[PDB]
């Protein structure tokens, strides 16, 4: 019964970790794309 409770806890903690990591991975994706565009367009406007 204590194993059940501690494993339900661990599952909830992993679900909240996947949420937080996904929210970081999305901010990183967006930042990466915006940086790549800023670099291309700066290259074009230099010409």
């Amino acid at each position: 019964a204590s194993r059940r409770r501690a494993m339900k806890s661990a599952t909830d903690n992993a679900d909240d970790l996947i949420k937080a990591l996904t929210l970081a991975a999305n901010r990183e994706r967006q930042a990466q794309i915006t940086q790549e565009i800023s670099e291309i367009v700066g290259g074009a406007n230099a010409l």
Partner: protein, 49 residues
């Protein structure tokens, strides 16, 4: 800006004023529009410097 200007005229007369900006992120996005249409280069998160 105009909200603050309407406010300041009362403020310098010695009235008390309350200002609610709802919401100041959409002003930042409008300034990002006006700057990028002016072709100024973007800084972080595409916002102008």
């Amino acid at each position: 800006y105009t909200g603050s200007a309407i406010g300041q005229h009362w403020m310098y007369n010695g009235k008390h004023v309350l200002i609610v900006f709802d919401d100041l992120s959409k002003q930042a996005d409008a300034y990002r529009a006006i700057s990028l249409l002016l072709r100024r280069p973007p800084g972080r998160e595409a916002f102008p410097g």
